[PDB]
Amino acid sequence: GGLETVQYVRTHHQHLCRENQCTSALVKHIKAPLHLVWSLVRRFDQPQKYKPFVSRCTVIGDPEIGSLREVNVKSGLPATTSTERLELLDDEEHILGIKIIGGDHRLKNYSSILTVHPEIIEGRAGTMVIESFVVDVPQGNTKDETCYFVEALIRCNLKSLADVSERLASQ
């Protein structure tokens, strides 16, 4: 199911990419009810409640579909700021899509789709999160390098999402 979407994206989808584009998917299992995980992920205006590298986020007006956020990130990264647009938010089906449309970083034409799914983990309510992205390969890099570096960032985000969710769940 999870491993299945990951194999389809890394193979079929990667086959569909432009030569200067790459794509992958990450799966994370989280020992918390879907309501808790979804309540964190859906907050387009508050990524810093679980994304470890976001220092600041500004949204003017309601964080509704089509809005923009400006995020500042912590020191130590090849970036200081990113402007991102909310492309999709479906509270009934639990799907979130974003596109990065500006900033001083190296990710051009980055789009992500994140979905959240209910499951059982050791006889308890759990949640599976799948996040997939497509992004351009910056000039002097390869698809592999770009994918692995972006994957590291998403894994940090989903691990932190899991930690926060499971902490909240134990209450």
Ligand X SMILES: CC1=CC(=O)CC(C)(C)[C@@]1(O)/C=C/C(C)=C\C(=O)O
Would you say 46 or 125 has its CB closer to ligand X?
46
Assigned token pair, 141: 């890099």
SS3 of residue 108 by DSSP: coil
SS3 of residue 77 by DSSP: coil
Q: 9: burial class by Cβ within 10 Å (0-12, 13-18, 19+)? A: buried
In sequence order, the 6+-apart residues with CB closer than 8 A to the CB of 99 are 84, 85, 87, 109, 110, 111, 112
Would you say 79 or 125 has its CB closer to ligand X?
79
* Distance (Å, whole) CA 4 – CA 141: 28
Assigned token pair, 60: 């003017």
Q: Is 105 in the site for ligand X (CB under 6 A)?
A: yes
Rg (CA), the chain: 16
Q: Is 77 in the site for ligand X (CB under 6 A)?
A: yes
* Distance (Å, whole) CA 96 – CA 16: 22
Q: Is 124 annotated as a binding residue?
A: no
Site string for ligand X, 108-127 (x = CB under 6 A): ----x---------------
Stretch that binds ligand X, among 23-31, 32-40, 88-96, 153-161 (CB under 6 A): 153-161
Q: Is 79 annotated as a binding residue?
A: yes
CB atoms within 10 A of CB 162: 19
Q: Is 132 in the site for ligand X (CB under 6 A)?
A: no
Q: Is 107 in the site for ligand X (CB under 6 A)?
A: yes
Would you say 58 or 124 has its CB closer to ligand X?
58
Binding-site member from 88, 153, 164, 168 for ligand X (CB under 6 A): 153
> In the range 34-53, which residues lie near ligand X by CB under 6 A?
51, 53
Where is the binding site for abscisate, in residues?
51, 79-84, 106-112, 131
Which residues lie near ligand X (CB under 6 A)?
51, 53, 73, 77-79, 82, 100, 103, 105, 107, 112, 150, 153-154, 157
Where is the binding site, in residues?
51, 79-84, 106-112, 131
